[PDB]
Subunit: 236 residues, 3 copies
């Protein structure tokens, strides 16, 4: 996260860190708890992942230093990628992880609500991006989960900033005209969380951008409300 600050332990209790054990164990990408056997994340995270067996999901984590050989985790029973995904920039960047066991909900780990089809015209004013990603384009994975408040921008606006891409209605964009705050490498698959009517909604999945936090380059996120049918179908 560029231009963010350290989170308070458990203020983002749906946020997970997904690790790979190959070749030695490391953070791979963010994700969100949406059901007690279910993590919502980005399809692109699974490039060159041949098996769910090398994946570990850690919940209730603030600092990456909490994770050691003796730390408990959830195994992944199945990776489910949207059947129309090709790459982050052309959309459908969405995947589900079916956990081998179920998450016991608690103050340190609990699900985030999905937005509802009838909220397509809601104006979110309290949206945050979170993760353990780089603090600039050339950096390293951060120990402490970072947060940053970022305003939504309309698709018409986002499209003007990405003339060489098609910004579709299945994407949503967030950023400062002058940049300075954004996701970056290591944040993808994580949530864009917006509080509305005292409740937090999973509005976006962190997906792609041109560099990190650059002026006139909003972050691009998978527009979660567009996939609620798909989520329902697959989580059966």
């Amino acid at each position: 996260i560029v231009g963010g600050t350290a989170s308070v332990r458990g203020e983002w209790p749906w946020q997970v860190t997904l690790h790979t054990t190959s070749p030695t164990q490391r953070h791979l990408c963010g994700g969100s708890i949406i059901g007690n056997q279910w993590i919502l994340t980005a399809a692109h995270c699974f490039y060159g992942v041949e098996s769910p067996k090398i994946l570990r999901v850690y919940s209730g984590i603030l600092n990456q230093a909490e994770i050691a050989e003796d730390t408990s985790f959830f195994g992944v029973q199945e990776i489910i990628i949207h059947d129309q995904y090709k790459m982050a920039e052309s959309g459908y960047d969405i995947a589900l992880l079916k956990l081998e066991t179920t998450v016991n909900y608690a103050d340190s780990q609990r699900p985030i609500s999905l937005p509802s089809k009838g909220d397509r015209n809601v104006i979110y004013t309290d949206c945050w991006v979170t993760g353990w990603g780089y603090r600039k384009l050339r950096d390293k994975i951060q120990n402490t989960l970072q947060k940053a408040k970022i305003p939504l921008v309309t698709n018409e606006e986002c499209q003007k900033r990405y003339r060489g891409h098609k910004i579709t209605h299945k994407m949503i964009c967030a950023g400062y005209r002058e940049g300075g705050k954004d996701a970056c490498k290591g944040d993808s698959g994580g949530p864009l969380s917006c509080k509305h009517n005292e409740v937090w909604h999973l509005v976006g999945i962190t997906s792609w951008g041109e560099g990190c936090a650059q002026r006139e380059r909003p972050g691009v996120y998978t527009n979660v409300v567009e996939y609620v049918d798909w989520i329902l179908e697959k989580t059966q």
Copy 2:
């Protein structure tokens, strides 16, 4: 209907009683007129129904005692069940009956309007459940069509009351925290009718609940607005 009252003749002119003639003729479930050859009802009503030939649809009925051997009815040309239905509790509990002849609309029999996709955020405050079902869990089919006003509850609220089920965005729930008014056995397939802007909309199809009218157990209804594409496709 638990805790309801007798309806006035024709105040629910889209409400039908669907009968089976096997082994002797009896009420099977409720339904709603949505087009002049078309009844909207619940898929689960057709468990063990091998043929449309044993089905009779009665319209303009207030009292089950109006129905006798010489009473006219509409035969069913075809039963159409949603192809993803398995059982009431996992959703898609929706079916269409194509009538052999067309209904002549009149004050005693006429169609109810379907809700529109752009009403997903409407707040219905005037909703009623109707049918000839039991007045409690252990009872019998009632002679006179009963009605009851029941408030909608949000899906988040409904979900808390049904911890062992998945209450999906394709369901909608209605009930009193303290219970006392609800559908019951014999009511299913019938409408949940809500009046908005001087017009009645078919918001729900009566589907399932844990017992009838129990405290903290709202009734669960198929969320009709979610199926308008499906209704359009099939009624061609």
Copy 3:
């Protein structure tokens, strides 16, 4: 267009005239620029069109007399018709033309924005129908692009006027109770353009009606917001 007036050059810069070169060149129908290789139009326009090779798309046109042998045009690489279209009156009257080259946007030719799924409850009050069609049922193609302001009517209202048709939620209707202003022969495939919040949206595609501009016979238009998924899918 019945009861309309001459347009100002370039006030409808997304409007195109689609011509056929067989047997001698003539106007065939209207269309709208929605992307720089993409025209949105009506499926029915392509009845008996065996090949894209005989199609020419002209942009930046006010008067049909601008079109001559030496006038530049865009060839069509591909005709894409909705796979569920059978005929205008049963709906799905929508088609895309993939142009052989890309349109250079300018003040005389530029794309119109598609409505968004979250605008299904917007109340459009500033809607216009445009084209080079007949000024009455028995007439000829007009030289100068005509315009007419026409109010939207609800589907319930439209349905009452077309008792022998099914007016679906994928259609939208516009007209005066007393008639007098409407599309007519030669206008189809063209836009119904509504200005909302200082922006123009492509709300309808001119599709069908009973005669032209008759009292109690609104024009019927393909309801574009219902096809945004389809447009996205096909324009890949």
